[PDB]
Design a protein around this ligand. Structure first.
Ligand code: 1RI
Length: 259
């Protein structure tokens, strides 16, 4: 490719897998209301899984959790599937089976590239007003974290020589449902999302470097410890993102071309 610097992101523990909300440990650490925080997380995890079951084949692709969306691109005899009836094919729970599985991921990809900047047309209103109301309800507890990290991502996405990728441990379909909904679709191309569920984040890191080559600068930006050791044993500069002030430094270091 033409990319010079690649930023690998691990937005779990804060955005994708925000398990601190549901356990209530987030509310205790930051001194917020426990009951309200869990209610926002329980509503969120519902509207996410409700979209994956009615749009992204969550029940079909529940166990067949791949790692990249283009993995089964070899069994795809590319066809106009605007008429392909998924409810009446040989799918259940396999060269003729992998083709039906591969079509579904391309249909998932079609939904991503189509409604990633127009969610209100994907989930018809008022499901947007109620759900955009949910953002301010949560960003009022996290001090606009998703908005803040979107600034650091758009400060990278607009650079033609720089790019960003995402490496989470959720299954690919639920992770795509969150990235689509949460608004991270404008900064994350769907071809740059990896699911470290069965393989771990280290193997997902090696898979990224093999794609972009050695002439590029790889930087890891995330929170937690799983990707810190995965970025250390691959000599990739790790960027902690725990505090809110650690993000202001990430922007200020990109404003001045220090990265
Ligand atoms: O903001 C978000 N997480 N923040 C997490 C976090 C942990 C530590 C800190 S820093 C801090 N500073 C001061 C006080 C508290 N914490 O932030 C978030 C996560 C997911 C989705 C999300 O948006 C939406 C949008 C639409 C619908 C539903 C959610 C927003």
């Amino acid at each position: 490719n033409e990319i010079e610097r690649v930023f690998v992101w691990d937005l779990d523990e804060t955005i994708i897998i925000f398990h601190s909300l549901l356990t209530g440990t987030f509310a205790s650490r930051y001194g917020k209301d426990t009951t309200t925080s869990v209610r926002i997380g329980l509503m969120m995890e519902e509207m996410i899984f409700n979209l994956a079951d009615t749009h992204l084949f969550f029940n079909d692709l529940e166990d067949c959790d791949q790692i990249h969306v283009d993995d089964v691109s070899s069994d795809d005899n590319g066809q106009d599937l605007s008429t392909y009836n998924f409810s009446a094919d040989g799918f259940h729970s396999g060269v003729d089976w992998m083709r039906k599985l591969a079509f579904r991921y391309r249909r998932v990809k079609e939904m991503y590239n189509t409604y990633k900047n127009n969610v209100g047309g994907l989930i018809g209103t008022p499901k947007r007003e109620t759900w955009l109301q949910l953002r301010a309800e949560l960003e009022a507890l996290t001090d606009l974290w998703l908005t803040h990290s979107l600034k650091a991502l758009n400060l990278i996405n607009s650079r033609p020589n720089c790019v960003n990728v995402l490496v989470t441990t959720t299954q690919l379909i639920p992770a795509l449902a969150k990235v689509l909904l949460y608004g991270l679709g404008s900064v994350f191309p769907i071809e740059n999302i990896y699911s470290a569920t069965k393989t771990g984040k280290e193997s997902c890191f090696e898979r990224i470097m093999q794609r972009f080559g050695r002439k590029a600068v790889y930087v890891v930006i995330g929170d937690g410890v799983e990707e810190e050791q995965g970025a250390k044993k691959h000599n990739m500069p790790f960027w902690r993102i725990s505090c809110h002030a650690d993000l202001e430094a990430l922007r200020h270091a990109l404003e001045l071309e220090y990265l």
